[PDB]
Design an enzyme around this catalytic site. Structure first.
Site, mmCIF file in Angstrom:
data_model
loop_
_atom_site.group_PDB
_atom_site.id
_atom_site.type_symbol
_atom_site.label_atom_id
_atom_site.label_comp_id
_atom_site.label_asym_id
_atom_site.label_seq_id
_atom_site.Cartn_x
_atom_site.Cartn_y
_atom_site.Cartn_z
ATOM 1 N N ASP A 70 0.695 -1.271 -0.059
ATOM 2 C CA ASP A 70 0.014 -0.079 0.044
ATOM 3 C C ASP A 70 0.771 1.235 0.019
ATOM 4 O O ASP A 70 0.198 2.286 -0.394
ATOM 5 C CB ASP A 70 -1.043 0.017 1.225
ATOM 6 C CG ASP A 70 -1.556 -1.175 1.442
ATOM 7 O OD1 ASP A 70 -2.416 -1.534 0.387
ATOM 8 O OD2 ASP A 70 -1.516 -1.919 2.464
ATOM 9 N N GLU A 196 -11.110 6.161 6.658
ATOM 10 C CA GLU A 196 -11.876 6.185 5.264
ATOM 11 C C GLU A 196 -13.234 6.638 5.023
ATOM 12 O O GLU A 196 -14.068 5.867 4.705
ATOM 13 C CB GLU A 196 -11.635 4.795 4.539
ATOM 14 C CG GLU A 196 -10.169 4.290 4.354
ATOM 15 C CD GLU A 196 -9.860 2.930 3.810
ATOM 16 O OE1 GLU A 196 -10.611 2.022 3.996
ATOM 17 O OE2 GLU A 196 -8.902 2.882 3.255
ATOM 18 N N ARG A 211 -15.214 4.111 8.283
ATOM 19 C CA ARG A 211 -14.753 2.728 8.497
ATOM 20 C C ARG A 211 -14.108 2.509 10.144
ATOM 21 O O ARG A 211 -13.252 3.178 10.477
ATOM 22 C CB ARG A 211 -13.536 2.121 7.648
ATOM 23 C CG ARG A 211 -13.138 0.653 7.803
ATOM 24 C CD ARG A 211 -11.572 0.658 7.671
ATOM 25 N NE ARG A 211 -10.998 0.494 6.382
ATOM 26 C CZ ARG A 211 -10.087 -0.596 5.943
ATOM 27 N NH1 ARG A 211 -9.804 -1.439 6.786
ATOM 28 N NH2 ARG A 211 -9.921 -0.559 4.642
ATOM 29 N N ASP A 243 -19.955 -3.098 7.201
ATOM 30 C CA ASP A 243 -18.748 -3.357 7.386
ATOM 31 C C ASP A 243 -18.448 -4.794 6.769
ATOM 32 O O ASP A 243 -19.302 -5.692 6.694
ATOM 33 C CB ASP A 243 -17.985 -2.941 8.508
ATOM 34 C CG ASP A 243 -16.443 -2.613 8.328
ATOM 35 O OD1 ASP A 243 -15.965 -2.827 7.160
ATOM 36 O OD2 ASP A 243 -16.065 -2.127 9.114
ATOM 37 N N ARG A 290 -14.185 -9.713 0.303
ATOM 38 C CA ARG A 290 -14.624 -8.503 -0.422
ATOM 39 C C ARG A 290 -15.497 -8.998 -1.923
ATOM 40 O O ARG A 290 -14.778 -8.741 -2.777
ATOM 41 C CB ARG A 290 -13.425 -7.654 -0.680
ATOM 42 C CG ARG A 290 -13.432 -6.401 0.408
ATOM 43 C CD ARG A 290 -12.400 -6.284 1.254
ATOM 44 N NE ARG A 290 -11.044 -5.553 0.778
ATOM 45 C CZ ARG A 290 -10.414 -4.536 1.492
ATOM 46 N NH1 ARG A 290 -10.944 -4.539 2.924
ATOM 47 N NH2 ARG A 290 -9.508 -3.724 1.000
ATOM 48 N N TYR A 325 -13.302 -1.936 -2.001
ATOM 49 C CA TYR A 325 -13.534 -0.294 -1.544
ATOM 50 C C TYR A 325 -14.874 0.032 -2.437
ATOM 51 O O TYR A 325 -15.237 -0.429 -3.407
ATOM 52 C CB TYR A 325 -12.435 0.507 -1.596
ATOM 53 C CG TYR A 325 -11.438 0.695 -0.665
ATOM 54 C CD1 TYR A 325 -11.268 -0.661 -0.096
ATOM 55 C CD2 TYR A 325 -10.837 1.512 -0.244
ATOM 56 C CE1 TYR A 325 -10.392 -0.746 1.080
ATOM 57 C CE2 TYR A 325 -9.986 1.523 0.838
ATOM 58 C CZ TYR A 325 -9.677 0.451 1.453
ATOM 59 O OH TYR A 325 -8.674 0.473 2.726
HETATM 60 C C1 AXP Z 1 -2.595 4.640 4.482
HETATM 61 C C2 AXP Z 1 -2.935 2.952 4.170
HETATM 62 O O1 AXP Z 1 -2.102 2.265 4.584
HETATM 63 N N1 AXP Z 1 -4.241 2.699 3.856
HETATM 64 C C3 AXP Z 1 -4.398 1.226 3.508
HETATM 65 C C4 AXP Z 1 -5.450 0.744 4.679
HETATM 66 C C5 AXP Z 1 -5.021 0.716 6.058
HETATM 67 O O2 AXP Z 1 -4.229 -0.547 6.255
HETATM 68 C C6 AXP Z 1 -6.094 0.283 7.004
HETATM 69 O O3 AXP Z 1 -7.018 1.373 7.085
HETATM 70 C C7 AXP Z 1 -5.742 0.260 8.520
HETATM 71 O O4 AXP Z 1 -5.831 1.436 9.050
HETATM 72 O O5 AXP Z 1 -6.266 -0.548 4.090
HETATM 73 C C8 AXP Z 1 -5.730 -1.066 3.045
HETATM 74 P P1 AXP Z 1 -6.624 -2.601 2.885
HETATM 75 O O6 AXP Z 1 -6.530 -3.456 1.622
HETATM 76 O O7 AXP Z 1 -8.005 -2.596 3.213
HETATM 77 O O8 AXP Z 1 -6.130 -3.529 4.069
HETATM 78 C C9 AXP Z 1 -5.411 -0.313 1.799
HETATM 79 C C10 AXP Z 1 -4.792 1.164 2.239
HETATM 80 O O9 AXP Z 1 -3.728 1.193 1.437
HETATM 81 CA CA CA Z 2 -14.703 -3.284 11.282
#
Ligand code: AXP
Ligand code: CA
Ligand SMILES: *[C@@H]1O[C@H](CO)[C@@H](O[C@@H]2O[C@H](CO)[C@@H](O[C@@H]3O[C@H](CO[C@H]4O[C@H](CO)[C@@H](O)[C@H](O)[C@@H]4O)[C@@H](O)[C@H](O[C@H]4O[C@H](CO)[C@@H](O)[C@H](O)[C@@H]4O)[C@@H]3O)[C@H](O)[C@H]2NC(C)=O)[C@H](O)[C@H]1NC(C)=O
Ligand code: NAG
Ligand code: NAG
Ligand code: NAG
Length: 388
Positions: A70, A196, A211, A243, A290, A325
């Site tokens: 990420d 988010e 979230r 969620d 998802r 998402y």
């Molecule tokens: C800034 C950042 O890292 N955002 C990442 C976010 C965080 O991992 C969670 O918000 C934990 O706080 O989630 C992932 P996801 O595939 O859902 O895991 C994608 C994003 O890149």
């Molecule tokens: Ca949750």
């Protein structure tokens, strides 16, 4: 050119009608398309654009390998007109591994975040120029909406958060005018974790459905008072719950006030919005993964704790296809302000191990007060034709 004040009733909606799809992944098997994730859409008062955070590489490119990560210094915020896929002529607007944009009526605002996790920095770029910046306040991953912000009378609002993912954290609401931070409010009310957010105007306020990556499978709500900068937070009343992971419509709850503690850890960005006492919302069809995506109306799901009277359901992506998402965006009609949403269709690494990259396509719907049919619109690619 006057500033958007968004003071029009919310259009009465019957459901959502198809609006756009970019077929990104299908094209990538025979074209140079950007690798992206966390996309979104926002419109100025004339046309809609589609944003996404790229991975500083195209798909048919050895550099795509291991794009499951990420945060790397090479992610930039891409921006194209809604419908044109992220090809090589796409403009990279800023350096950012987390972002949010909105138009105030006269210019675009782009909050872009990059840096070391423990000491990231966010640049506020307005009208093409870098107007202000801020640094991490909890030395543990400064992050933001990943969807559009919103402005009323020239003042834009963006909720951000620094802190633990699955633990207490620090969420503040910056108020920004012309790119300049003119005020910062801390989260108030009863929301335990806020990440988010998917915000929307509600003259004279702004409301967000976020979230909770910690203790809740029910979604938090953040109410922002554009006048005095006061904040309030709760959780959505509905017992249906949006969620992922979540419980099971049968054994799932929400009291409107606290994280339900049901399969609370982790989550996925999503939306919802109020209509009188009812609530419109969408969520993955699966409760563990998802996969699939549906939307419906929960009679009294805004005002009455635990309501589960569902109606007006629509399946956007069938339960057998990947989604991801999703968020909300508003467009000003002639007599009212309507609500629409997009849904990311992740493909690749994590679930699909044939290829070594991770990317997404999008599909977007808008509310309609007319009639509509049935269908399903998934990403569409065949992992067996794909490079890698
Ligand atoms: C800034 C950042 O890292 N955002 C990442 C976010 C965080 O991992 C969670 O918000 C934990 O706080 O989630 C992932 P996801 O595939 O859902 O895991 C994608 C994003 O890149
Ligand atoms: Ca949750
Ligand atoms: C998170 O990010 C911030 C912003 O980048 C970092 O803060 C900056 O840190 C650097 C490094 O310390 C600062 O730049 C340095 O300033 C030093 C002077 O400050 C001290 O001494 C003076 C003496 O008058 C005091 O006034 C002041 O209060 C401090 O006590 C310089 O001496 C540094 O140069 C020397 O060190 C570098 C390596 O550090 C060598 O390579 C040089 O050759 C030289 O010997 C340097 O210029 C900077 O000013 C800080 N920002 C701000 C706004 O002040 C954080 O460090 C970072 N956090 C983490 C955890 O990574
Ligand atoms: C909102 O803006 C329009 C013009 O942009 C104006 O006519 C209207 O009165 C404004 N309403 C408010 C409440 O500011
Ligand atoms: C991708 O990267 C991993 C390690 O970074 C390596 O083992 C793998 O073979 C690579 N595969 C391809 C197809 O690039
Ligand atoms: C927006 O502007 C109008 C006209 O100046 C004002 O009366 C209105 O209350 C403003 N709204 C907000 C939320 O500041």
């Amino acid at each position: 050119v006057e500033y958007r004040n968004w003071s029009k009733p919310q259009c009465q909606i019957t459901g959502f009608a198809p609006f756009s799809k970019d077929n990104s992944i299908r094209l990538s098997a025979g074209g140079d398309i950007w690798v992206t994730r966390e996309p979104y859409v926002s419109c100025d008062p004339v046309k809609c654009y589609q944003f996404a955070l790229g991975q500083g590489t195209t798909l048919d490119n050895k550099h795509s390998n291991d794009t499951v990560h990420d945060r790397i210094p090479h992610r930039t915020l891409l921006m194209n007109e809604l419908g044109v896929p992220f090809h090589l002529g796409t403009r990279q607007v800023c350096i950012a591994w987390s972002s949010s944009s909105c138009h105030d009526g006269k210019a675009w605002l782009h909050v872009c975040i990059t840096g070391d996790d423990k000491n990231a920095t966010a640049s506020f770029i307005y009208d093409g120029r870098l107007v202000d910046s801020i640094g991490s306040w909890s030395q543990n991953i400064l992050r933001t909406q990943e969807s559009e912000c919103v402005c009323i009378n020239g003042t834009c609002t963006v909720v951000m958060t620094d802190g633990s993912a699955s633990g207490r954290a620090d969420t503040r609401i910056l108020f920004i005018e012309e790119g300049k931070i003119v005020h910062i409010s801390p989260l108030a009310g009863s929301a335990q974790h806020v990440e988010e957010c998917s915000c929307y105007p509600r003259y004279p306020g702004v409301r967000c459905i976020c979230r909770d990556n910690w203790k809740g499978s029910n979604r938090p709500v953040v109410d922002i008072n554009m006048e005095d900068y006061s904040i309030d937070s709760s959780y959505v009343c509905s017992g249906l719950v949006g969620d992922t992971p979540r419980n099971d419509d049968r054994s799932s709850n929400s009291n409107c006030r606290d994280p339900n503690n049901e399969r609370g850890t982790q989550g996925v960005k999503g939306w919802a919005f109020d209509n009188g006492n009812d609530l419109w919302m969408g969520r993955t069809i699966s409760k563990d993964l998802r996969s699939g995506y549906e939307t419906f109306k929960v009679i009294g799901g805004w005002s009455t704790p635990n309501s589960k009277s569902q109606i007006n359901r629509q399946v956007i992506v069938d339960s057998d296809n990947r989604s991801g998402y999703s968020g909300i965006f508003s467009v000003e009609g002639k007599s009212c302000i309507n609500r629409c949403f997009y849904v990311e269709l992740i493909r690749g690494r994590k679930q699909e191990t044939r290829v070594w990259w991770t990317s997404n396509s999008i599909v977007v719907f808008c509310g309609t007060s007319g009639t509509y049919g049935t269908g399903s619109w998934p990403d569409g690619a065949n992992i067996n034709f794909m490079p890698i």
